[PDB]
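Hi W.,

Here's what went into the run:
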Amino acid sequence: TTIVGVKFNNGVVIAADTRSTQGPIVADKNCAKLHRISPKIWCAGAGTAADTEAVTQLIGSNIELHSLYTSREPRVVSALQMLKQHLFKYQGHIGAYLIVAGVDPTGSHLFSIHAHGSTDVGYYLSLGSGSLAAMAVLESHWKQDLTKEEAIKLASDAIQAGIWNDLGSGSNVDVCVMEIGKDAEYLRNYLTPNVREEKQKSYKFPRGTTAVLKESIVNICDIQEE
Amino acid sequence: TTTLAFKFQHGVIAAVDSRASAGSYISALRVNKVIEINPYLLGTMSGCAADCQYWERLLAKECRLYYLRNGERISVSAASKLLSNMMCQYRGMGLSMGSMICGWDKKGPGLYYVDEHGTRLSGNMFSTGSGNTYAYGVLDSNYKWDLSVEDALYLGKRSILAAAHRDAYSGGSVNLYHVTEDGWIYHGNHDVGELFWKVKEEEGSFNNVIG
Amino acid sequence: TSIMAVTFKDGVILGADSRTTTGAYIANRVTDKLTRVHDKIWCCRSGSAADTQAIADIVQYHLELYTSQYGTPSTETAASVFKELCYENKDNLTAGIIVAGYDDKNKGEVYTIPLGGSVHKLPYAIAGSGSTFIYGYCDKNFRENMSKEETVDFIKHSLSQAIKWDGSSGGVIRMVVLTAAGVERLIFYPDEYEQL
Amino acid sequence: TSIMAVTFKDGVILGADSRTTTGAYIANRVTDKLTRVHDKIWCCRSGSAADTQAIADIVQYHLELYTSQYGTPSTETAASVFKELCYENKDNLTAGIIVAGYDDKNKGEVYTIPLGGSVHKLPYAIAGSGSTFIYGYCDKNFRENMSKEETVDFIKHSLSQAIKWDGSSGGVIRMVVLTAAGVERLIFYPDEYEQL
Amino acid sequence: MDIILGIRVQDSVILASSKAVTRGISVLKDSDDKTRQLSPHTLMSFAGEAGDTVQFAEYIQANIQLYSIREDYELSPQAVSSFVRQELAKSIRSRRPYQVNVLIGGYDKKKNKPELYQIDYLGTKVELPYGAHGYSGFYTFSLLDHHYRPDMTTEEGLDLLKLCVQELEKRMPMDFKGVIVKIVDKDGIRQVDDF
Amino acid sequence: MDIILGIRVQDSVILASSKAVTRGISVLKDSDDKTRQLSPHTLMSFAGEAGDTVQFAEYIQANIQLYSIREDYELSPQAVSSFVRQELAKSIRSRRPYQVNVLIGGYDKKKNKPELYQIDYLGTKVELPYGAHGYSGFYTFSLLDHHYRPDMTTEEGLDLLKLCVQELEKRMPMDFKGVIVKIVDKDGIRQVDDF
Amino acid sequence: QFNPYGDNGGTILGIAGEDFAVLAGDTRNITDYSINSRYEPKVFDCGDNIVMSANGFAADGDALVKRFKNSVKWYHFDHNDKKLSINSAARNIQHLLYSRRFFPYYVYNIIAGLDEDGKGAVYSFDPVGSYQREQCRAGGAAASLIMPFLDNQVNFKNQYEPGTNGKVKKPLKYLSVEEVIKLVRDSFTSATERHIQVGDGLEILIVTKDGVRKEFYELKRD
Amino acid sequence: SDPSSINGGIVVAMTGKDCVAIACDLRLGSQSLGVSNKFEKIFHYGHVFLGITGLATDVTTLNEMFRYKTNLYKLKEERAIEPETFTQLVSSSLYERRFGPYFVGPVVAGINSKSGKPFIAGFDLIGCIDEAKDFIVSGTASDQLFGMCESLYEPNLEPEDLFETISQALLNAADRDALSGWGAVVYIIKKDEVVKRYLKMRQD
Amino acid sequence: TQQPIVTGTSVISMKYDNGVIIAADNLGSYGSLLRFNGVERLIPVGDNTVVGISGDISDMQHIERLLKDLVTENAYDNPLADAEEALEPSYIFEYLATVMYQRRSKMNPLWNAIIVAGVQSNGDQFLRYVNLLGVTYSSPTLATGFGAHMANPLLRKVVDRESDIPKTTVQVAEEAIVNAMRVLYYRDARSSRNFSLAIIDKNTGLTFKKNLQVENMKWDFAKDIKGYGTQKI
Ligand SMILES: *[B]([O])([O])[C]([C][C]([C])[C])[N]C(=O)[C]([C]C1=[C][C]=[C][C]=[C]1)[N]C(=O)C1=[C]N=[C][C]=N1
Ligand SMILES: *[B]([O])([O])[C]([C][C]([C])[C])[N]C(=O)[C]([C]C1=[C][C]=[C][C]=[C]1)[N]C(=O)C1=[C]N=[C][C]=N1
Ligand SMILES: *[B]([O])([O])[C]([C][C]([C])[C])[N]C(=O)[C]([C]C1=[C][C]=[C][C]=[C]1)[N]C(=O)C1=[C]N=[C][C]=N1
Ligand SMILES: *[B]([O])([O])[C]([C][C]([C])[C])[N]C(=O)[C]([C]C1=[C][C]=[C][C]=[C]1)[N]C(=O)C1=[C]N=[C][C]=N1
Ligand SMILES: [Cl-]
Ligand SMILES: [Cl-]
Ligand SMILES: [Mg+2]
Ligand SMILES: [Mg+2]
Ligand SMILES: [Mg+2]
Ligand SMILES: [Mg+2]
Ligand SMILES: [Mg+2]
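Here's what came out:
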């Protein structure tokens, strides 16, 4: 997994690859690692997939209720605090490694959070197995006062470094841009540099190739009238 | 793996399955678990394939040298003992080999069981490998010394089928051999998939399975 | 990690490196280990980042509630709340914390809380993996009632050496000055402190 | 154990504490860790007492036989014989040795040989459990081409601090001076070096 | 304990269970009945860890007997087998699981059909024409696969069962001291006193 | 292997040894003869780890047969037992010891006396009126302690031996597939073909 | 503790035709989650019209190939420049592997070429030296992904003729070199998609009576 | 020892043109011993189909649990549950046992009754959703199935063509797995008709 | 079997149009202690080869002596020792690879990761890796330890495949190497600012650069970072 977060002039951008693995096998080639906690607070997750989704949905649910209770738009520091206290309580057993970003009435924010509950602040961050390849790119090309366009480029380039160089990462690049005073734009499959080439042959079989013993209609309808 | 061999009126039958596994993965559908040592000697294979192949092909070297020095063919008893002595040298070193040495010599048909511990047992009937318990069931209830070559061949064949069906690490195909005083005779490769259905219909067995 | 807190004439100064490591990988090179639990009561954190953050957050909550009821808490009181958490949860925590604060009555005070959860009031304190390499230097060079400028130089030189020899320490040297005048943050970059 | 060897203008000086421990029991409080392998080639020993004695005895034998055939050996040659023993028998040895010697051609030289059996030629070297606490102090205070009196003070102050903080170090501070003038032994007692 | 076998024929279910009980290196008993009647037309044989087996069996028996009295009605073999399975699936994730494998032989009076259910200690249920637990199946299934028909009589079922026991007695290293055989049919449960 | 028994009566030594050989969970053979004739009036039965037993027995046999040819003379049972003991005491401190326990039954033609020696794999030798290895003695020694006389006939020795085997067959969990019985007396060694 | 073994990934595939044989393998070399090389040749021409690949622990693989190439050289010296037949090479390799029975070469090895009647031959080996002639064999990391596909598309397993419904099997018609190469490329393209250690490049060595030819194809680099 | 490979078994699902297919083997074993050749691993709740591989006791338990929950859903909602909604229910139910999980590999397949859109999904033992467009695989021969599906599959296959593709993917994967086989079933699912076919295969 | 005591971190390298570049820092670490600051881990062999070594320093010094002896031995009875029969990079590597694999086979390895960089007689670039297991591989870019995870991604952006080598100049290649060394200093806890760099060109020969420093570092942004989440001061 390669996930990154990059701050810029008027907001923040996060990105991620789309590969999920169990051992050396790829389970999903186009998996979605960018999560919506609230409309303008999104987080990318690495580690155990069920945990990143579950912890994100739970805090996102409680954030929504909090927003309704307070008549205010949710803050990134609230999601950050709720996530870290939840993860700390489970002493690292909930394997969620997240990059949390968003815009709120206070401004734009970018944080990382580890499974044991520690949080970090930064202008650029990376997590996952490909975080070293991505951070190498970020440390080489990052600068203060980036534009929106420059930050998206930097973020996707950082993910690509993970895609090509880390076996735990691959396939496509997902991006989400959170700019101040605007709707957050979720760019699913922003880049698609790993389309499979055409196969040499068609493996469509002649009808009747497979040997059959019995046939039967399955009743999926309810009990009928009359 | 399921192997069996039994003495009877007209020599000895040898039957083996053909499956090879690496964990749950079936690595080979068609392995040859019988080695033709000489025209009158056979050896079955169960355990580590490398050990079975190496030490039984090395046995054939030693049996050939016996024939050249003495001008006479080696007995089944002597051949089985040479092999059991090889195992005794690597006693404890981790070899894994279970085999039956089948043949015909001056005393008539001969059958010896040999394993990696150095064990050497003479007998009328043996079976080795993960599926040997299933084969023994069919063998013990149907075996007679009065068997014909045709019926004996079928018994060994049917016994491997029984094991191939129930044992997950046995299957693929059945290799049959019939050892006589004029030498061993190969009776073909028999796919278990095709054999199962054939036997089910003709014999009426395996009623529990739908076909 | 290389952290220290030093009392001087006008109050107390906290100092720290900015390195966070996962084995040999530097997970954060610009970490802020100087943490505020009250206006003029700060702490230096070493050990588990998760543990020391969780502790400091709980302490900040306790002192905020203390303040609402009883007014400004003493540095000793803050150290006691840290201690209570570190001592009672010693089996499950890995936290080495230095507590430093400025009162007008008591002036600058420093309390160190090592792994076991014991408390030790000292003129100055050093902690973290990198502190081992500067026990000799700090003992030889520390004086009581130093000036602000002297104390800054003492911490800068001390942490410079701790960073030089300790692989788990590095980055920038952060400092926080606590006096009657207020709270001042200082930062010193590699090109400055490496040539010392 | 706290040991060090320091080159200076007129040659080289070796220094050591005198403590030998079995756990927390001090088995010998007046140990001599400064060992002679040739007239003006000495070594400082740390780690296993049995191992470092066995090694030094073998080296002394090798250099005595070298001398009978080829004349006085260089300090580098002595360090190489130590290295060969420490490197080739690394699985079974626990020895941290500093080799120091005086030639007329090469003057004062210092070679440190840590656990793995690697060799490092340095202006000065520190080793033993207590050395950790004086990396900062020694790095800040060492100068090249010091006088005899300055070098003695440097070693005295350095080992004083190492002894102060390290439980495995203590007793008297022994020193051996290697120059053209000859070989001088020095000793400094607790009442002298503790008040520094 | 060791050996339990089951076979469902045309009009009945036959259960065969070993008689031996061993403590340490000594066989304490050679006439132990490893079975409990759950209802007039439902029999359960069992095998597993010492103590747990009887404890679990008697607990199931009490529950089915309680149901029978409450409703004045006999539960179907299928219903009983599902209740038993749930109790074992419940048990496997407990602090200390009950290490018990069972066969449930019953005659369904509604459908007029014999039924044999095999359930292991994990709560793994399967309906079978013949079944076994432990190593018993390794020796006996090849014979059953060959000789079994669904239209067999009770007498033919007993003869095939004798052949299975003979094969076990020949190729098993352990002496299980023969088997007690019981038949479950429309008339209820009865024991074959000569086997 | 499992079971080996020995009894010295008035004018002979009787050895009884089990017939079973087990590989994994399957009994491969039920007619195995766990014995070797060392000399015309000396028999050795054996039990222990697979392979080692026969290997050791045949090695001892070869050595005694070599001695017999060289000297044209049969060694006394005592002399053979001491040779065997030394080989086992030698073996126990080897890189890989031979895990074999033996009974040596012999008739001394010089003294006109039967003799039974029990030797374990450590090289622990004892001369006894009756003996056993492994767990065999736990079941049988109480019967032998009660019924044994030194003036017993060979026929009485066989009857007491039958009682021992019956007790084993009742209280042992393992099926050892009966025993092969052999008698050693002044006329040599013979096998009892019906037991 | 020192672990003398490692895993360099990679996957290999041998297919025997009627009068030809192919031995293919990916060119990616890895440790854990890192790529060492995108192009590190794994299939080698060993002389005498024999090709070879030892897949698994690369150090043991290189050592075995090096020793076999050496065995071919000395076979010429000792037996008057006689051509080493594929069956003789196979038996020789068994003894090379079994010499380290108690400290094995950690590799799955395949050789390919032509038998003495000019027909296509593939031999397959386990790490300890068991071997056998085969028509079709995939080895290495993605071996379990590829073999079932080859059972279906090379030996027509579970395929029957339409209309008969399971009564008549699909006849085992022979495959051309162009047809085999298509199946090889699709096998590796599929393996690359689902196996992280497979990718970068595919190198195929084709053996005929005319000699040994090479073909290279790009694979996905992620 | 490994709970996910004690009993053995496999499940595979595929999408086609206005159709889906889901298939499974029929084996239940105790490691090497084959116990049953009639242990079906595919269940259905209305028009939503669920295949489950792994530990057999949990397969049975989860089927009974989802029958329980879908029957209540229907009584309250007054409609049958849809594949998308059921997928979330499976995920929620598995994650509630995060630290004491069911050792299973579930697979959902069906067609949304309102949109008519084909749908498949796979899960790990603890609820992570894999919502693939092409195919989902599960079980002891999942590596084999991935290789078969990835080469044999092509999008927009007609129901009778999809049947052949999924059948050959299952059969040949099972024949390279010791713990799978002993029969096989294939469900072909269209918006308002479902056909079930038992396949003839080798019984070893 | 042993454990490494005094250790050296990453060695990084890449090919360019006319030759190869290799670099490694000057640190000898003792666990987390940054013990020795003047350790040369690039060792030239003649004027056509540089061997870069990471891992155990005592074993490095042993290898250094083997190479020094190899040069001495090659000159024996060799009139063309400084010409046609001089040591090639391929000879030096194969020798080391033989030694490494033999030592692992005796369960007593040299605890190192080695990169041999050089230029052959015919002008061809040589760049190959070998380690304690005897594992060998070649690539347009090669790196050991942390360099493999952080340097290779950066260097592969310059030379992604074989066809990019002729398009890459010595200025571009050195720039990439120097940047990678800065990145490793930011992120590797066992690295130092001081390093050595060597260029072996088929035209200009061997250029060995000592006492290089990581420069142009970005740290200013650290002043704005406060707390770990909610803290504002
Ligand atoms: B990435 O590698 O961090 C990635 C991020 C995730 C949010 C999609 N993680 C995974 O792919 C994990 C790796 C892993 C394997 C084994 C244990 C823990 C983590 N995979 C899964 O969570 C996974 C695996 N198989 C099916 C479903 N999910
Ligand atoms: B049989 O199962 O004993 C068989 C006999 C051998 C001659 C082919 N052995 C194997 O299948 C073994 C695994 C095994 C399974 C069950 C019991 C014992 C052993 N596999 C191998 O020998 C082997 C060798 N190379 C590759 C794959 N498998
Ligand atoms: B310092 O090294 O003590 C430092 C202080 C912390 C408050 C930022 N701790 C760490 O870097 C620890 C590891 C450690 C190193 C040395 C001594 C003790 C502990 N790291 C973490 O807590 C950590 C690392 N990566 C991610 C999350 N947390
Ligand atoms: B010093 O502590 O390294 C010292 C130097 C030695 C040459 C006199 N070593 C010891 O005191 C060692 C124990 C030890 C302590 C600290 C670090 C390493 C080793 N003690 C002995 O070798 C010893 C103790 N008692 C009897 C005999 N030997
Ligand atoms: Cl922190
Ligand atoms: Cl001493
Ligand atoms: Mg540092
Ligand atoms: Mg002291
Ligand atoms: Mg069951
Ligand atoms: Mg791939
Ligand atoms: Mg089978």
